[PDB]
Tab-separated table of C-alpha atoms and ligand atoms in Angstrom:
chain	number	residue	atom	x	y	z
A	1	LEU	CA	-9.036	92.661	105.392
A	2	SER	CA	-7.432	89.126	106.204
A	3	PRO	CA	-6.162	87.106	109.213
A	4	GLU	CA	-2.761	86.222	107.543
A	5	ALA	CA	-1.960	89.801	107.432
A	6	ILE	CA	-1.590	89.579	111.329
A	7	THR	CA	2.010	88.405	112.266
A	8	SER	CA	2.776	86.254	115.343
A	9	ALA	CA	4.811	89.492	116.769
A	10	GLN	CA	1.717	91.737	116.288
A	11	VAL	CA	-0.186	89.228	118.321
A	12	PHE	CA	2.147	89.177	121.171
A	13	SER	CA	2.236	92.945	121.140
A	14	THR	CA	-1.501	93.400	121.319
A	15	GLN	CA	-1.711	90.900	123.841
A	16	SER	CA	0.825	92.191	126.111
A	17	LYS	CA	-0.970	95.527	126.434
A	18	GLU	CA	-2.782	94.930	129.765
A	19	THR	CA	-4.537	98.328	130.225
A	20	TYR	CA	-8.124	98.631	131.601
A	21	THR	CA	-11.599	100.296	130.666
A	22	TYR	CA	-14.945	101.079	131.961
A	23	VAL	CA	-18.151	99.302	131.210
A	24	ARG	CA	-21.163	101.125	130.078
A	25	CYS	CA	-24.421	99.533	131.128
A	26	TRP	CA	-27.420	100.135	129.104
A	27	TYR	CA	-31.045	99.382	130.065
A	28	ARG	CA	-34.671	99.706	128.868
A	29	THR	CA	-36.081	102.845	131.080
A	30	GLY	CA	-39.585	101.946	130.261
A	31	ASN	CA	-41.428	98.694	131.750
A	32	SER	CA	-42.387	96.844	128.459
A	33	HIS	CA	-41.488	96.108	124.612
A	34	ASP	CA	-43.734	99.079	123.660
A	35	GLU	CA	-41.008	101.499	124.682
A	36	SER	CA	-37.574	100.933	122.889
A	37	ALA	CA	-35.736	104.030	124.732
A	38	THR	CA	-32.846	103.221	126.573
A	39	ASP	CA	-30.270	104.960	129.166
A	40	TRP	CA	-27.052	104.173	130.859
A	41	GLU	CA	-24.815	104.214	133.899
A	42	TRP	CA	-21.227	103.281	134.234
A	43	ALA	CA	-20.993	99.639	135.785
A	44	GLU	CA	-20.014	100.024	139.511
A	45	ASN	CA	-18.203	97.937	142.245
A	46	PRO	CA	-20.319	96.772	145.062
A	47	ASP	CA	-19.112	99.780	146.952
A	48	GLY	CA	-20.190	102.140	144.258
A	49	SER	CA	-16.751	103.006	142.740
A	50	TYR	CA	-16.630	102.722	139.293
A	51	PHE	CA	-15.904	99.188	138.104
A	52	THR	CA	-13.281	98.335	135.504
A	53	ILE	CA	-12.053	95.446	133.549
A	54	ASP	CA	-8.303	94.601	132.602
A	55	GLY	CA	-7.402	93.661	129.117
A	56	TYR	CA	-6.080	94.652	125.802
A	57	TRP	CA	-7.890	96.527	122.569
A	58	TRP	CA	-7.385	95.465	119.119
A	59	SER	CA	-9.235	97.024	116.037
A	60	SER	CA	-8.471	96.668	112.158
A	61	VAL	CA	-9.497	100.237	111.528
A	62	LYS	CA	-13.920	99.420	115.687
A	63	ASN	CA	-11.925	98.284	118.625
A	64	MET	CA	-12.810	95.314	120.498
A	65	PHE	CA	-11.588	94.829	124.218
A	66	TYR	CA	-10.274	91.288	125.333
A	67	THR	CA	-10.432	90.785	128.999
A	68	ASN	CA	-10.305	87.562	131.348
A	69	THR	CA	-13.338	88.628	133.320
A	70	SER	CA	-16.264	86.347	132.836
A	71	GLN	CA	-19.349	87.792	130.977
A	72	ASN	CA	-21.343	86.423	133.562
A	73	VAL	CA	-19.293	88.669	136.393
A	74	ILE	CA	-19.788	91.857	133.926
A	75	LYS	CA	-23.526	91.256	133.577
A	76	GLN	CA	-24.097	90.995	137.483
A	77	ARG	CA	-22.037	94.110	137.993
A	78	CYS	CA	-24.334	96.103	135.599
A	79	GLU	CA	-27.545	94.544	137.024
A	80	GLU	CA	-26.296	95.441	140.415
A	81	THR	CA	-25.495	99.097	139.468
A	82	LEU	CA	-28.560	99.762	137.509
A	83	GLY	CA	-30.968	97.928	140.192
A	84	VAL	CA	-33.480	97.523	137.714
A	85	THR	CA	-37.021	96.337	138.764
A	86	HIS	CA	-39.132	96.167	135.979
A	87	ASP	CA	-39.517	93.001	133.679
A	88	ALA	CA	-38.218	94.066	130.378
A	89	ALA	CA	-34.830	95.790	131.509
A	90	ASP	CA	-33.120	94.036	128.554
A	91	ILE	CA	-29.805	94.756	129.936
A	92	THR	CA	-26.613	94.925	127.718
A	93	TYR	CA	-23.042	96.197	128.232
A	94	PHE	CA	-20.242	97.248	126.457
A	95	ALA	CA	-16.463	98.692	126.937
A	96	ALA	CA	-15.697	102.367	126.753
A	97	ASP	CA	-13.284	104.755	128.133
A	98	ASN	CA	-15.633	107.787	128.566
A	99	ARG	CA	-18.736	109.332	127.317
A	100	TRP	CA	-17.687	110.127	124.048
A	101	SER	CA	-16.633	106.404	123.337
A	102	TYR	CA	-18.738	104.195	121.157
A	103	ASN	CA	-20.130	100.985	122.320
A	104	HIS	CA	-17.262	98.411	122.000
A	105	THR	CA	-17.735	94.983	122.223
A	106	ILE	CA	-16.430	92.959	125.396
A	107	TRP	CA	-14.601	89.589	124.387
A	108	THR	CA	-13.891	87.275	127.273
A	109	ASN	CA	-10.591	85.158	126.525
A	110	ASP	CA	-10.959	81.325	126.659
A	111	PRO	CA	-9.111	79.448	129.228
A	112	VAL	CA	-5.874	77.195	128.514
A	113	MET	CA	-8.017	74.365	129.984
A	114	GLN	CA	-10.670	73.669	127.359
A	115	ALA	CA	-12.570	70.613	126.073
A	116	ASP	CA	-15.405	70.556	123.423
A	117	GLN	CA	-17.943	72.495	124.905
A	118	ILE	CA	-19.502	75.615	123.396
A	119	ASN	CA	-18.583	78.604	125.065
A	120	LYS	CA	-19.735	81.173	122.756
A	121	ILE	CA	-21.882	82.266	119.926
A	122	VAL	CA	-20.700	84.321	116.773
A	123	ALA	CA	-23.390	85.749	114.696
A	124	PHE	CA	-23.234	86.601	111.094
A	125	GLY	CA	-26.102	88.134	109.048
A	126	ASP	CA	-27.627	91.269	108.353
A	127	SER	CA	-30.481	93.503	109.990
A	128	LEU	CA	-32.477	90.412	111.051
A	129	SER	CA	-29.426	89.686	113.490
A	130	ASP	CA	-27.615	92.971	113.940
A	131	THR	CA	-27.341	94.136	117.691
A	132	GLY	CA	-25.264	97.367	117.224
A	133	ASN	CA	-22.898	97.459	114.201
A	134	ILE	CA	-24.408	99.678	111.826
A	135	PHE	CA	-25.676	101.720	114.878
A	136	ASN	CA	-22.370	102.462	115.860
A	137	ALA	CA	-21.054	103.203	112.719
A	138	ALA	CA	-23.990	105.676	112.241
A	139	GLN	CA	-22.918	107.406	115.480
A	140	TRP	CA	-25.964	106.278	117.019
A	141	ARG	CA	-28.438	108.097	114.998
A	142	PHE	CA	-29.604	105.079	112.671
A	143	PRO	CA	-32.021	103.388	113.506
A	144	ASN	CA	-33.417	105.987	115.921
A	145	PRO	CA	-32.714	104.992	119.447
A	146	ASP	CA	-36.245	106.263	120.889
A	147	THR	CA	-37.957	103.617	118.470
A	148	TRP	CA	-35.761	100.739	117.457
A	149	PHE	CA	-34.035	99.251	120.725
A	150	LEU	CA	-30.592	100.513	121.053
A	151	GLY	CA	-29.349	99.525	117.373
A	152	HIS	CA	-31.558	96.594	117.037
A	153	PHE	CA	-34.024	96.822	114.142
A	154	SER	CA	-36.630	95.886	116.490
A	155	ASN	CA	-38.170	96.720	119.853
A	156	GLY	CA	-35.887	94.524	121.843
A	157	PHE	CA	-33.552	91.665	121.519
A	158	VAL	CA	-33.177	89.706	118.337
A	159	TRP	CA	-33.278	85.838	117.960
A	160	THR	CA	-29.628	85.237	118.460
A	161	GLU	CA	-29.567	87.122	121.711
A	162	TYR	CA	-32.600	84.950	123.257
A	163	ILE	CA	-30.603	81.694	122.189
A	164	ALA	CA	-27.697	83.155	124.019
A	165	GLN	CA	-29.478	83.778	126.903
A	166	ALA	CA	-31.175	80.410	126.859
A	167	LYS	CA	-27.737	78.832	126.856
A	168	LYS	CA	-26.056	81.353	129.278
A	169	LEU	CA	-23.226	82.076	126.271
A	170	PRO	CA	-22.113	85.096	125.264
A	171	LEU	CA	-22.952	86.543	121.832
A	172	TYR	CA	-20.243	88.373	119.418
A	173	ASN	CA	-22.155	89.826	116.775
A	174	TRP	CA	-20.787	90.595	113.233
A	175	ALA	CA	-23.956	91.227	111.622
A	176	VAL	CA	-24.451	94.355	109.878
A	177	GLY	CA	-27.828	95.899	109.321
A	178	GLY	CA	-28.103	96.677	105.593
A	179	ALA	CA	-31.535	98.143	105.896
A	180	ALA	CA	-32.664	101.135	103.625
A	181	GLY	CA	-30.325	104.045	104.420
A	182	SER	CA	-27.473	101.899	105.703
A	183	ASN	CA	-25.402	102.559	102.314
A	184	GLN	CA	-24.460	106.086	103.741
A	185	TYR	CA	-22.740	104.665	106.980
A	186	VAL	CA	-20.743	101.917	105.395
A	187	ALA	CA	-20.522	100.514	101.684
A	188	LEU	CA	-22.449	97.195	101.198
A	189	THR	CA	-20.463	94.270	102.067
A	190	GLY	CA	-21.199	90.481	101.701
A	191	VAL	CA	-21.413	88.128	104.649
A	192	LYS	CA	-18.024	86.598	103.385
A	193	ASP	CA	-16.647	90.062	104.635
A	194	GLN	CA	-17.985	89.294	107.989
A	195	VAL	CA	-16.521	86.084	108.057
A	196	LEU	CA	-13.072	87.667	107.192
A	197	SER	CA	-13.508	90.413	109.587
A	198	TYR	CA	-14.334	87.999	112.549
A	199	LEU	CA	-11.270	85.961	111.624
A	200	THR	CA	-8.972	88.743	111.966
A	201	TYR	CA	-10.224	89.784	115.489
A	202	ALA	CA	-10.254	86.046	116.515
A	203	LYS	CA	-6.509	85.696	115.637
A	204	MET	CA	-6.116	88.167	118.580
A	205	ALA	CA	-8.045	86.208	120.871
A	206	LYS	CA	-6.234	83.922	123.249
A	207	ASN	CA	-6.513	80.133	123.593
A	208	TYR	CA	-9.494	80.351	120.861
A	209	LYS	CA	-10.457	77.287	119.419
A	210	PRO	CA	-13.005	77.820	116.510
A	211	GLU	CA	-14.399	74.277	117.123
A	212	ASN	CA	-16.066	75.564	120.448
A	213	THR	CA	-17.910	78.301	118.762
A	214	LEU	CA	-21.668	78.034	117.882
A	215	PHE	CA	-21.814	79.946	114.615
A	216	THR	CA	-25.264	81.217	113.196
A	217	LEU	CA	-25.314	82.687	109.626
A	218	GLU	CA	-28.436	84.230	108.018
A	219	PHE	CA	-28.259	86.452	105.126
A	220	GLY	CA	-29.981	87.744	102.133
A	221	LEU	CA	-32.827	89.580	103.027
A	222	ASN	CA	-31.489	92.972	102.829
A	223	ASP	CA	-29.495	92.079	99.664
A	224	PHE	CA	-32.939	91.184	97.942
A	225	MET	CA	-35.271	93.712	99.228
A	226	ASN	CA	-33.134	96.789	99.204
A	227	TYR	CA	-30.447	95.958	96.953
A	228	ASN	CA	-32.038	93.854	94.176
A	229	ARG	CA	-29.104	91.579	94.391
A	230	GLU	CA	-29.223	88.662	91.925
A	231	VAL	CA	-29.709	85.021	93.425
A	232	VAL	CA	-26.595	83.747	91.794
A	233	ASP	CA	-24.480	86.402	93.381
A	234	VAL	CA	-25.914	86.062	96.932
A	235	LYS	CA	-25.415	82.094	96.302
A	236	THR	CA	-21.733	82.875	95.653
A	237	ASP	CA	-21.474	85.373	98.748
A	238	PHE	CA	-22.982	82.679	100.820
A	239	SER	CA	-21.057	79.590	99.538
A	240	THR	CA	-17.829	81.820	100.031
A	241	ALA	CA	-18.471	82.740	103.469
A	242	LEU	CA	-19.193	78.907	104.497
A	243	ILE	CA	-16.026	77.876	102.449
A	244	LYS	CA	-13.960	80.433	104.625
A	245	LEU	CA	-15.714	79.637	107.910
A	246	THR	CA	-15.146	75.772	107.542
A	247	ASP	CA	-11.661	76.292	106.356
A	248	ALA	CA	-10.743	78.202	109.461
A	249	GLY	CA	-11.734	75.295	111.596
A	250	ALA	CA	-15.729	76.086	112.389
A	251	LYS	CA	-17.653	72.728	113.128
A	252	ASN	CA	-20.801	73.946	114.699
A	253	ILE	CA	-23.197	76.128	112.756
A	254	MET	CA	-26.943	77.214	112.538
A	255	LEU	CA	-28.404	78.331	109.432
A	256	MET	CA	-31.845	79.547	108.534
A	257	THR	CA	-33.968	80.130	105.623
A	258	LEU	CA	-35.249	83.502	104.827
A	259	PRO	CA	-38.649	84.513	105.695
A	260	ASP	CA	-40.922	85.757	102.808
A	261	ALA	CA	-40.275	89.478	103.549
A	262	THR	CA	-42.968	90.423	100.915
A	263	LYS	CA	-45.397	89.851	103.721
A	264	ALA	CA	-43.949	92.611	105.412
A	265	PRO	CA	-46.072	96.062	105.660
A	266	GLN	CA	-43.563	98.038	103.496
A	267	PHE	CA	-44.769	95.869	100.495
A	268	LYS	CA	-48.543	97.582	100.656
A	269	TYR	CA	-46.870	100.085	98.761
A	270	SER	CA	-45.223	97.942	96.294
A	271	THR	CA	-46.230	96.553	92.987
A	272	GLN	CA	-47.456	93.039	92.577
A	273	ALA	CA	-44.650	92.538	90.045
A	274	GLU	CA	-41.856	93.527	92.882
A	275	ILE	CA	-43.777	91.373	95.572
A	276	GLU	CA	-43.676	88.396	92.884
A	277	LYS	CA	-40.061	89.278	91.990
A	278	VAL	CA	-38.502	89.346	95.280
A	279	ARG	CA	-40.521	86.449	96.449
A	280	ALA	CA	-39.003	84.555	93.861
A	281	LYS	CA	-35.470	85.078	94.717
A	282	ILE	CA	-36.359	84.183	98.380
A	283	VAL	CA	-37.710	81.019	96.975
A	284	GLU	CA	-34.455	80.275	95.107
A	285	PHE	CA	-31.950	81.369	97.507
A	286	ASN	CA	-33.762	79.406	100.512
A	287	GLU	CA	-33.398	76.085	98.238
A	288	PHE	CA	-29.703	76.898	97.911
A	289	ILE	CA	-29.245	77.493	101.924
A	290	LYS	CA	-30.995	74.046	102.156
A	291	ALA	CA	-28.607	72.376	99.791
A	292	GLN	CA	-25.287	73.912	101.459
A	293	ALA	CA	-26.696	72.833	104.828
A	294	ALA	CA	-27.087	68.948	103.685
A	295	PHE	CA	-23.757	69.365	101.903
A	296	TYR	CA	-21.861	70.284	105.044
A	297	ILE	CA	-23.711	67.680	106.951
A	298	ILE	CA	-22.477	64.808	104.623
A	299	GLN	CA	-18.979	66.240	104.894
A	300	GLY	CA	-19.283	65.508	108.739
A	301	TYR	CA	-20.136	69.187	110.342
A	302	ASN	CA	-22.502	69.972	112.777
A	303	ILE	CA	-25.084	71.743	111.092
A	304	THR	CA	-28.534	72.712	112.180
A	305	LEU	CA	-31.169	74.185	109.603
A	306	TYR	CA	-34.026	76.032	110.987
A	307	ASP	CA	-37.102	76.629	108.343
A	308	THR	CA	-37.662	80.312	109.382
A	309	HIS	CA	-39.478	80.759	106.102
A	310	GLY	CA	-42.045	78.222	106.927
A	311	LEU	CA	-42.394	79.763	110.262
A	312	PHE	CA	-42.941	82.985	109.113
A	313	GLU	CA	-45.602	81.564	106.568
A	314	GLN	CA	-47.382	80.170	109.416
A	315	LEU	CA	-47.301	83.417	111.593
A	316	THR	CA	-48.478	85.667	108.709
A	317	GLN	CA	-51.127	83.079	107.470
A	318	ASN	CA	-52.526	82.753	111.067
A	319	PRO	CA	-51.108	84.773	113.563
A	320	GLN	CA	-53.518	83.952	116.183
A	321	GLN	CA	-52.798	80.161	115.747
A	322	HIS	CA	-49.309	81.400	117.415
A	323	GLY	CA	-50.120	83.837	119.994
A	324	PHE	CA	-50.390	87.090	117.814
A	325	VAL	CA	-53.150	89.382	116.764
A	326	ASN	CA	-51.990	91.295	113.978
A	327	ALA	CA	-49.423	90.161	111.072
A	328	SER	CA	-50.408	92.598	108.471
A	329	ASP	CA	-49.779	95.990	110.041
A	330	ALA	CA	-47.010	97.941	111.394
A	331	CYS	CA	-47.158	98.214	115.290
A	332	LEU	CA	-45.549	101.652	114.616
A	333	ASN	CA	-47.711	104.356	112.883
A	334	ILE	CA	-45.769	104.309	109.875
A	335	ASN	CA	-47.684	104.591	106.656
A	336	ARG	CA	-45.264	104.310	103.720
A	337	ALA	CA	-41.849	102.528	102.861
A	338	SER	CA	-38.935	105.226	103.329
A	339	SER	CA	-35.469	104.933	104.455
A	340	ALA	CA	-35.671	108.108	105.997
A	341	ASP	CA	-38.018	106.689	108.601
A	342	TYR	CA	-35.374	105.080	110.641
A	343	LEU	CA	-33.792	108.459	111.427
A	344	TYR	CA	-36.927	109.581	113.386
A	345	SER	CA	-38.791	108.571	116.417
A	346	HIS	CA	-42.493	107.243	115.691
A	347	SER	CA	-45.397	106.434	118.129
A	348	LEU	CA	-47.374	103.221	118.458
A	349	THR	CA	-50.751	103.037	116.507
A	350	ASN	CA	-53.780	103.083	118.937
A	351	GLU	CA	-54.423	99.231	117.948
A	352	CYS	CA	-50.937	98.559	118.661
A	353	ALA	CA	-50.930	100.285	121.877
A	354	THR	CA	-54.168	98.478	122.720
A	355	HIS	CA	-53.026	94.896	122.175
A	356	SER	CA	-49.482	95.584	123.071
A	357	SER	CA	-46.384	94.945	120.758
A	358	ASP	CA	-45.866	91.629	121.750
A	359	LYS	CA	-49.243	90.670	120.005
A	360	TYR	CA	-47.694	91.918	116.734
A	361	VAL	CA	-45.628	90.461	114.073
A	362	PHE	CA	-44.128	93.724	112.571
A	363	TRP	CA	-42.542	96.414	114.524
A	364	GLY	CA	-41.937	98.991	111.817
A	365	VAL	CA	-43.004	98.263	108.266
A	366	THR	CA	-40.207	95.961	107.746
A	367	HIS	CA	-38.815	93.977	110.582
A	368	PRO	CA	-40.308	91.570	113.026
A	369	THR	CA	-41.055	92.413	116.837
A	370	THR	CA	-38.995	91.171	119.789
A	371	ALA	CA	-41.744	88.785	120.622
A	372	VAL	CA	-41.338	87.057	117.049
A	373	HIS	CA	-37.751	86.954	117.520
A	374	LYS	CA	-38.444	85.198	120.765
A	375	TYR	CA	-40.849	82.733	119.134
A	376	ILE	CA	-38.083	81.812	116.639
A	377	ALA	CA	-35.552	81.349	119.133
A	378	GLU	CA	-37.935	78.909	121.168
A	379	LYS	CA	-38.714	76.930	118.183
A	380	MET	CA	-35.111	76.391	117.600
A	381	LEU	CA	-34.438	75.446	121.166
A	382	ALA	CA	-37.233	73.113	121.241
A	383	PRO	CA	-36.357	69.339	121.813
A	384	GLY	CA	-35.642	67.510	118.584
A	385	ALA	CA	-35.504	70.879	116.575
A	386	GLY	CA	-31.559	69.879	116.068
A	387	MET	CA	-29.930	71.946	118.862
A	388	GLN	CA	-29.269	68.858	120.764
A	389	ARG	CA	-26.095	67.852	118.062
A	390	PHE	CA	-24.170	70.766	119.913
A	391	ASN	CA	-21.989	70.530	122.894
A	392	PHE	CA	-23.388	72.699	125.389
A	393	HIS	CA	-22.472	73.275	129.020
A	394	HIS	CA	-24.935	72.178	131.834
A	395	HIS	CA	-25.872	75.027	134.210
A	396	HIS	CA	-27.575	74.181	137.835
B	401	LIG	BR1	-39.027	98.093	111.267
């Protein structure tokens, strides 16, 4: 769509609809990252009655709920309701009227009184960042939620969620998994369409200052591996997205280079020609990512660039040096590269069960494990790694 299509009267009308909804609290039922399965309960008040949040819905087609209730209070209720005592509960929560509803994002509106501190993370990208968009578009069938953690292409949280947790910030995700098989649930779109969608929802928020959002952007992996997109087209999509984000007032952006995805187990079933071909696109596109970062820095923006490509090379070249045991095999017992495998549950191999999925780089044949996503977040959070340039709150 386009944020300009939303009129002032429409904003007033939308924001004046003060309804209420319930909160679905998801948690990991098993007690380690080896088990992706999740279940849920409705959030409760302290006395056990159902918890509700007041606010308003808006959707272009995919409804988001806008509330004044803080994310920290919603999380606290879910934690109090579920009372999970194991270590990997990995609780997440969503708005829903009833059991037939999908998992809708809860957006906390900002206060009128606001300075220049970062107050949220907004993520753009593909299956390396998606936390539930293709999963909801696929009616919770893809990727299968017994084996991939509730709509994440991993066995747990992805890197953006670990960053958000470290900084105690909400994460609002626009990234869309474009893994093999996604096409059947939503036509391929660029990352610039994610920026457009985000800007339309942001127009319905109250007191929204785009300069207080930390934007994260990674894109291209699914485009190159699965869709054979040309580098020049991905360049055009990526630069168009940054133009649109900065034109809308973004100031704080985290970028990352693409990992060399030809190191993934699925390329055991590929030709050397395809390996060299995909790899070359990634090498070329990564130089464009770096050049865009340098350009926006010179233009005065707060840009960090993390060389995820170089980090992945270190992990796949010498996993033991970085706390991992295996960087060549899928942890899951998947012995081919097929889109249909995301529809089914899969067991761990004996070797992965022996060492634990936290010691593997790869979960299935394509995507990294949640331990890798954590390793990335920790590297990005490290002193001197660049996040010092953003205006974060402190928390005692
Ligand atoms: Br995977």
